[PDB]
Amino acid sequence: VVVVNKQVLLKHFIPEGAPKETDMELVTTGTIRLRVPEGSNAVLLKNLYLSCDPYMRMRMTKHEEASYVDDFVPGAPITGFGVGKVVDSSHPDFKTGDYVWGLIGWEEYSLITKPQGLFKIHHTEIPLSYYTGILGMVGLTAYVGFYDICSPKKGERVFVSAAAGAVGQIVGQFAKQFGCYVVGSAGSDEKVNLLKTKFGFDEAFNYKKEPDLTKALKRYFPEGIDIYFENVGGPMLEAVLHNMRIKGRIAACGMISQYNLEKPEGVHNLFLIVGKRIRLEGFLVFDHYGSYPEFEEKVVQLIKEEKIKYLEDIVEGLENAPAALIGLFEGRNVGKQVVVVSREKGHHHHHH
Amino acid sequence: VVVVNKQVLLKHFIPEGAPKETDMELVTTGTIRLRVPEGSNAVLLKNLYLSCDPYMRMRMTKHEEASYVDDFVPGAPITGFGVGKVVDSSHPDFKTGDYVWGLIGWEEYSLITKPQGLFKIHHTEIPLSYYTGILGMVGLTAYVGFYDICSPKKGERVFVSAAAGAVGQIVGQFAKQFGCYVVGSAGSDEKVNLLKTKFGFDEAFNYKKEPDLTKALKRYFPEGIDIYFENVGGPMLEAVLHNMRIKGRIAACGMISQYNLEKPEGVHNLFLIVGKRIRLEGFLVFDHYGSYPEFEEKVVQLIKEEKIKYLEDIVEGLENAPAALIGLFEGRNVGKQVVVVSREKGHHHHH
Ligand SMILES: NC(=O)c1ccc[n+]([C@@H]2O[C@H](COP(=O)([O-])OP(=O)(O)OC[C@H]3O[C@@H](n4cnc5c(N)ncnc54)[C@H](OP(=O)(O)O)[C@@H]3O)[C@@H](O)[C@H]2O)c1
Ligand SMILES: NC(=O)c1ccc[n+]([C@@H]2O[C@H](COP(=O)([O-])OP(=O)(O)OC[C@H]3O[C@@H](n4cnc5c(N)ncnc54)[C@H](OP(=O)(O)O)[C@@H]3O)[C@@H](O)[C@H]2O)c1
Numbered sequence: 001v002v003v004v005n006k007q008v009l010l011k012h013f014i015p016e017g018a019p020k021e022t023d024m025e026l027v028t029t030g031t032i033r034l035r036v037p038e039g040s041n042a043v044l045l046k047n048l049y050l051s052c053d054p055y056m057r058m059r060m061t062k063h064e065e066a067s068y069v070d071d072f073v074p075g076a077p078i079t080g081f082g083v084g085k086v087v088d089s090s091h092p093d094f095k096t097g098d099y100v101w102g103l104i105g106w107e108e109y110s111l112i113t114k115p116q117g118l119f120k121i122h123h124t125e126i127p128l129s130y131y132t133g134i135l136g137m138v139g140l141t142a143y144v145g146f147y148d149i150c151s152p153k154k155g156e157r158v159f160v161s162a163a164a165g166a167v168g169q170i171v172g173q174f175a176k177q178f179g180c181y182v183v184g185s186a187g188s189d190e191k192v193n194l195l196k197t198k199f200g201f202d203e204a205f206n207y208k209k210e211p212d213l214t215k216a217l218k219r220y221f222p223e224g225i226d227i228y229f230e231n232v233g234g235p236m237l238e239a240v241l242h243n244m245r246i247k248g249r250i251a252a253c254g255m256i257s258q259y260n261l262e263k264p265e266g267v268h269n270l271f272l273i274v275g276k277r278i279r280l281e282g283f284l285v286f287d288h289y290g291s292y293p294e295f296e297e298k299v300v301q302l303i304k305e306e307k308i309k310y311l312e313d314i315v316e317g318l319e320n321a322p323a324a325l326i327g328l329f330e331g332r333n334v335g336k337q338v339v340v341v342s343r344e345k346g347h348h349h350h351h352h
Numbered sequence: 353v354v355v356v357n358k359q360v361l362l363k364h365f366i367p368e369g370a371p372k373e374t375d376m377e378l379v380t381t382g383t384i385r386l387r388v389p390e391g392s393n394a395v396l397l398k399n400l401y402l403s404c405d406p407y408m409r410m411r412m413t414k415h416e417e418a419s420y421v422d423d424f425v426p427g428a429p430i431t432g433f434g435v436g437k438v439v440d441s442s443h444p445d446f447k448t449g450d451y452v453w454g455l456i457g458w459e460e461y462s463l464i465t466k467p468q469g470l471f472k473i474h475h476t477e478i479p480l481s482y483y484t485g486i487l488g489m490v491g492l493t494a495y496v497g498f499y500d501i502c503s504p505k506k507g508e509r510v511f512v513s514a515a516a517g518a519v520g521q522i523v524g525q526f527a528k529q530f531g532c533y534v535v536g537s538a539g540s541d542e543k544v545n546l547l548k549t550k551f552g553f554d555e556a557f558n559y560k561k562e563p564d565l566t567k568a569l570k571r572y573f574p575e576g577i578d579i580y581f582e583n584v585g586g587p588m589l590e591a592v593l594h595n596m597r598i599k600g601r602i603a604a605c606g607m608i609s610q611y612n613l614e615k616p617e618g619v620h621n622l623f624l625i626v627g628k629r630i631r632l633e634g635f636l637v638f639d640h641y642g643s644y645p646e647f648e649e650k651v652v653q654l655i656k657e658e659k660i661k662y663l664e665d666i667v668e669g670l671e672n673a674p675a676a677l678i679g680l681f682e683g684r685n686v687g688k689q690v691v692v693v694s695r696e697k698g699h700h701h702h703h
Contacts, residue, residue: 264620264623267619268618271585274607280633282626
């Protein structure tokens with residue numbers, strides 16, 4: 001059997017700036033064999049779900065000095081985190097029928113020649129799409145960023161930006177259940193309302209309807225901020241610095257306001273870091289897979305007990321992957337942006 | 353027994369911008385009685401040596417919200433670290449003839465009503481002026497900053513801004529002795545040459561003669577920088593971040609480039625901290641006086657063994673303190689800036 005294998009390719013490198021749909025092209029003509037090559041040590045996946053993640057945009061720009069991940073290649077499939085089902089395997093740790101998450105192609109079938117970076121899914125009763133976010137890379141990021149990087153203590157005053165996002169909605173709930181006071185910023189009233197009801201944040205505000213971020217942070221933090229879970233950067237970062245307490249911490253998870261800027265914004269008040277003895281620390285979840293067992297143990301139990309809430313934004317079909325990715329930098333995604341490529345056989349779960 | 357007590361007063365608060373000599377006045381008519389008051393709990397000092405330190409500038413500006421340290425007060429003496437001799441004492445832990453360091457008045461005699469701020473000097477064989485710098489607040493800064501905040505490991509690559517300055521000349525040596533590759537930036541060819549001969553830095557450069565700081569750092573760090581001891585801020589930091597290695601650390605000691613500017617400059621590449629997993633951390637020596645005893649011991653041994661070098665810029669006389677202080681922000685000080693207010697009798701040789 002040879003079968004159809006649609007793909008989304010990167011049409012070309014793009015300059016600093018925003019990505020556009022037309023930087024990527026769907027190809028419907030491709031095909032694939034349903035067995036791994038003889039002599040291989042490899043896994044063929046049927047791909048089921050794809051994650052759209054903000055870090056993916058930077059990969060659409062050529063870098064001369066190797067960054068932490070390899071750039072995409074013009075004319076090759078876009079790649080990113082997703083979930084697949086093993087169709088065939090010449091690697092002993094993977095059997096036909098296993099479900100796995102890892103870096104896979106923006107396509108219907110991916111032949112993975114380095115299986116070692118696939119994670120076998122051990123909990124298939126949990127909806128599989130969760131392994132693209134909360135139980136995948138995104139959730140581990142929340143966990144490492146909050147519990148390790150932030151050094152939290154009960155009672156501390158915590159601010160999360162992009163707080164209705166995939167990372168931030170998780171962070172908020174961890175902080176809350178840790179016994180912290182928690183405030184989030186988000187880009188719409190719908191998000192704000194989700195933060196205050198569904199996610200149990202103490203307060204939230206719509207950053208786009210604030211003419212002054214410093215004063216706004218001052219409203220919700222009359223004694224200032226202990227901990228900032230930084231997802232955005234820009235002027236929001238300056239506003240936090242101004243409102244930060246002595247021995248405050250900032251876990252620099254990301255800086256999404258800067259990713260599509262020809263010209264990144266200046267941060268002006270870093271000297272506050274001296275007199276306030278602030279630690280500003282970046283981290284990359286790719287260094288922390290060693291933590292996964294402790295994390296998955298904690299998060300699977302929370303999910304199975306309904307003591308954490310999670311919101312996915314689902315888009316149906318490979319074809320809609322590119323726009324969904326672009327949507328992230330406009331804040332179109334409401335929750336964690338997933339793309340269904342093909343739903344696994346015998347699903348029977350309802351939705352609205 | 354009343355005597356003359358000359359003082360250097362803050363004339364007035366100053367706005368955003370650069371301080372100058374004339375923001376201070378020397379007054380010569382005042383006098384003081386050489387005993388502490390009965391029932392007092394105090395220590396009367398004859399002040400010997402005074403430190404000029406960069407943080408002093410910020411104290412000349414009014415702050416409606418409280419910085420780490422009180423603003424100076426117009427009409428009242430300038431204060432700062434120094435070294436003093438106890439003339440009279442109504443506080444148990446201090447006796448007549450003892451030597452101490454701590455915050456004292458810019459004047460000839462200071463009656464200290466908060467004696468718990470003072471530290472007795474236990475090595476009087478070392479020149480007492482050392483306790484305004486290498487053995488005082490300045491040395492402890494270097495030691496906390498490097499040994500604790502920078503988390504150093506044998507064989508890492510270290511860059512120091514204001515490297516010929518007091519803090520930075522100590523940092524560089526601590527680092528070289530820790531087995532690190534060390535480079536420093538300074539604002540003169542003379543300072544650059546001191547960093548390489550006297551202070552054992554591996555390389556150094558005149559920031560003022562580099563049109564591209566990013567490229568300059570790349571010349572000296574072909575595989576990037578592990579540790580940046582940050583005394584300067586601004587475009588230099590930006591340049592550092594561009595050249596910093598995976599899991600780099602920046603100990604934010606201070607950002608002197610920013611202290612006399614109406615508009616502080618913007619850092620544009622802070623996002624690199626995520627992708628390179630950089631820790632940037634401010635510290636204040638004020639929080640770390642618990643480390644003093646062990647630090648003192650360590651640096652005393654280095655001095656005894658001649659395993660560390662130290663250069664002081666010495667000015668003679670209180671009247672010369674104001675210029676001395678201003679010089680700091682122009683980089684006129686060559687070494688740790690000291691003012692001798694009065695020498696203790698019985699003495700080392702200088703040139
Ligand atoms: N360090 C790591 O290992 C690591 C791992 C995963 C993610 N990250 C980072 O973590 C952050 C969150 O990613 P996610 O996966 O949780 O994405 P997300 O929050 O699910 O989606 C991105 C969101 O960013 C917000 N946004 C976009 N442009 C913005 C701007 N110019 N100003 C302010 N907000 C803006 C939008 O929310 P609003 O409607 O509220 O604007 C959008 O919904 C990102 O910066 C990402 O790069 C880092
Ligand atoms: N965090 C803390 O607790 C703590 C404690 C003590 C000191 N500090 C900080 O550590 C730093 C060094 O202090 P120090 O006592 O050792 O001072 P210092 O280096 O003895 O003297 C200040 C030096 O700063 C340099 N400089 C002045 N203006 C500059 C500018 N615009 N750009 C670049 N460099 C400039 C000059 O040297 P060049 O010839 O090298 O330009 C000058 O010699 C300061 O930023 C200070 O505020 C922090």
